[PDB]
Design a protein around this ligand. Structure first.
Ligand SMILES: [Zn+2]
Ligand SMILES: [Zn+2]
Ligand SMILES: [Zn+2]
Lengths: 258, 46, 67, 152, 115
């Protein structure tokens, strides 16, 4: 009648990914934590692009699109920012947005690469993530230019895929299918998983009817917008917040019925 | 009141009048390109 | 035309990889060696550079209409 | 300032009866006013009257006649009568002597409140309450309250 | 053109209840919980937690349509035990195990980054 106690065992932690194992929880809890990695984690991404001038070969909406998908360092600001549509400001402010300015004219015979470095924030914490090279926004011939002001705002992955912090969330349970959820026609042809523990003589594990899905293996690779562990912390906090608001509306409706 | 057009091949700019034959001053090139508007544009980055 | 900023399936930031990919091709690597030298394990991120055509370099030959 | 009613069609002129009762002779090149066939007027006894209403004249210069309302003014009403041979039957009386027998359009606005906050658009249609905004970003025209809009 | 705006997945409007309880009339002690502006990422966990009560006789959810953002969670519990009580215990049990999971994840991070 109550919730089982899950537990976490982290196998590695890198600045790109985090790889961990959640034991003693249900399948739907585990899938939902994956889906909240993909969608419900809020980050900071550009959403309001004002093109002051443009002479580049790419048109305006293509440049605003490419400025959308640039990841921004939002490791601690996104907990402080309000959602833009929730703020009481005069339609933009530093409490719900981060200002960016790009001002590039090519005055040379070399093809000048307007990269992500030319995005200049007023907030020193929210900067584009780019060791690695910068993200190419637009190339420029001599004579061409672009000037724009771009406001970034808090949002999450259901709204648009530019607010998705994860590169990839690998998720697997029962890597030798003792549960036999998937039924291979010829299990000899099938490669073993990374988490398989059977010897090379054996193809798949023996079936147990009394088993249930547990020991969920995750590999959460971030795109750079968040550290891969604060994706998981923000996801758990967001799922608990969604459930708490659902409980508050539930209490209101029960008090309305009685 | 004059409209500024960009002179096609010349890539320079010049004024134009109502009921004015469309000619550049540099080489008389016949194709003008109207400059980009001065009012604001705003794109949702979606 | 220009390189996509994100891989379409994953969302892996692949837009910063293209010039380094050209550098690793001209430094006499194979394409498969250049991709995982850039660190693209998933094949959906490998098709994003392996089958890109950098068409904007053709578009920059033409003189800009506005000046 | 003063409307008229044609009472005779001629070769190069019109004979026109105004709200004053003065039959005039004017050129073909007067303007056609949009007629208000749903306009309301009040008689001397505060009853609602309209066009095609048979009304009696109880006061004024035409007191005693009875005519049909053909056109309406703010304070004048034109009456037709087939028995009265003058002016094709038309005359005029004041209505109180009778008895029954936007700015925001095309203005670049910015939604400053709500789910579409921060979008720049152009107002297509506008009312007292709401206004339709052609959004510059999306391929879609959506309607918002005027309290949510802020012009540039 | 007819593209629904992107905030239709999760933002409610004036005159939309987040949750709507409708007492089922076919069987005793059953309710339909209509959650507006949610998806499988809520109802799947609620369904799996309601299957863990020994006193819930039926626990299901469906979306009517994937283009319209609402789910229906049907609960039938044992008599003497209200399905609203089972639902408000499922939410508390989820918040319990997720807060416990978050704290154990914090402790695992402190283990990993500090050796
Ligand atoms: Zn604000
Ligand atoms: Zn010229
Ligand atoms: Zn990918």
């Amino acid at each position: 009648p109550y919730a089982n106690q899950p537990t976490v065992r982290i196998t590695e932690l890198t600045d790109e990914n985090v790889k961990f194992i959640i034991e003693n929880t249900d399948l739907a809890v585990a899938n939902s934590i994956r889906r909240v990695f993909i969608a419900e984690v809020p980050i900071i991404a550009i959403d309001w692009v004002q093109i002051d001038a443009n002479s580049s070969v790419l048109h305006d909406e293509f440049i605003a699109h490419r400025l959308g998908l640039i990841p921004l360092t939002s490791d601690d600001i996104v907990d402080k920012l309000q959602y833009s549509r929730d703020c009481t400001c005069e339609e933009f402010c530093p409490e719900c947005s981060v200002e960016f300015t790009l001002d590039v004219r090519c005055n040379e015979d070399q093809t000048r690469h307007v990269t992500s470095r030319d995005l200049i924030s007023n907030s020193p914490r929210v900067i584009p993530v780019t060791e690695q090279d910068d993200i190419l926004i637009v190339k420029l011939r001599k004579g061409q230019e672009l000037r724009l002001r771009a406001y970034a705002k808090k949002g999450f992955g259901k709204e648009h895929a530019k607010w998705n912090p994860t590169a990839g969330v690998a998720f697997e349970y029962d890597p030798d299918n003792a549960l036999r959820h998937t039924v291979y026609p010829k299990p000899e042809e099938w490669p073993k998983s990374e988490y398989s523990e059977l010897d090379e003589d054996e193809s798949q594990a023996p079936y147990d009817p009394n088993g249930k899905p547990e020991r969920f293996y995750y590999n959460v690779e971030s795109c750079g917008s968040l550290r891969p562990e604060t994706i998981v912390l923000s996801a758990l906090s967001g799922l608990k917040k969604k459930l708490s608001d659902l409980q508050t509306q539930l209490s209101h409706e029960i008090q309305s019925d009685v | 009141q004059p409209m500024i057009y960009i002179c096609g091949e010349c890539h320079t700019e010049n004024e134009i009048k109502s009921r004015d034959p469309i000619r550049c001053r540099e080489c008389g090139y016949r194709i003008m390109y109207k400059k980009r508007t001065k009012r604001l544009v705003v794109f949702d980055a979606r | 035309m220009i390189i996509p900023v994100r891989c379409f399936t994953c969302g892996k930031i692949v837009g910063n990889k293209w010039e380094a990919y050209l550098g690793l091709l001209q430094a006499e690597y194979t394409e498969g060696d250049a991709l995982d030298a850039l660190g693209l394990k998933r094949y959906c991120c490998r098709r994003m550079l392996l089958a890109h055509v950098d068409l904007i370099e053709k578009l920059l030959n033409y003189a800009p209409l506005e000046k | 300032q003063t409307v008229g009613v044609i009472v005779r069609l001629e070769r190069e002129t019109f004979q026109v009866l105004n709200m004053y009762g003065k039959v005039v002779t004017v050129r073909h090149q007067v303007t056609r006013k949009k007629d208000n066939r749903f306009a309301v007027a009040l008689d001397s006894e505060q009853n609602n009257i309209h066009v095609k209403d048979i009304v009696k004249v109880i006061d004024g210069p035409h007191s005693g006649r009875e005519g049909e309302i053909r056109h309406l003014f703010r304070s004048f009403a034109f009456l037709h009568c087939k028995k009265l041979v003058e002016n094709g039957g038309m005359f005029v009386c004041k209505t109180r002597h009778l008895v029954l027998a936007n700015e925001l359009i095309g203005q670049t606005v910015r939604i400053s409140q709500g789910p579409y906050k921060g979008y720049i658009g152009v107002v297509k249609d506008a009312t007292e309450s709401t206004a339709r905004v052609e959004l510059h970003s999306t391929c879609q025209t959506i309607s918002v309250d005027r309290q949510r809009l802020t012009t540039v | 053109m007819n593209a629904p705006p992107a905030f239709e997945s999760f933002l409610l409007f004036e005159g939309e209840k987040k949750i709507t309880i409708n007492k089922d009339t076919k069987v005793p002690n059953a309710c339909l919980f209509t959650i507006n502006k949610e998806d499988h990422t809520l109802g799947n966990i609620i369904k799996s937690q309601l299957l863990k009560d020994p006193q819930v006789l039926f626990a299901g959810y469906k979306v009517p349509h994937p283009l319209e953002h609402k789910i229906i969670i049907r609960v039938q519990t044992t008599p003497d035990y209200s399905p609203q009580e089972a639902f408000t215990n499922a939410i508390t049990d989820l918040i319990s195990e997720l807060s416990l999971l978050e704290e154990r994840f914090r402790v695992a991070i402190k283990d990993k980054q500090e050796g």
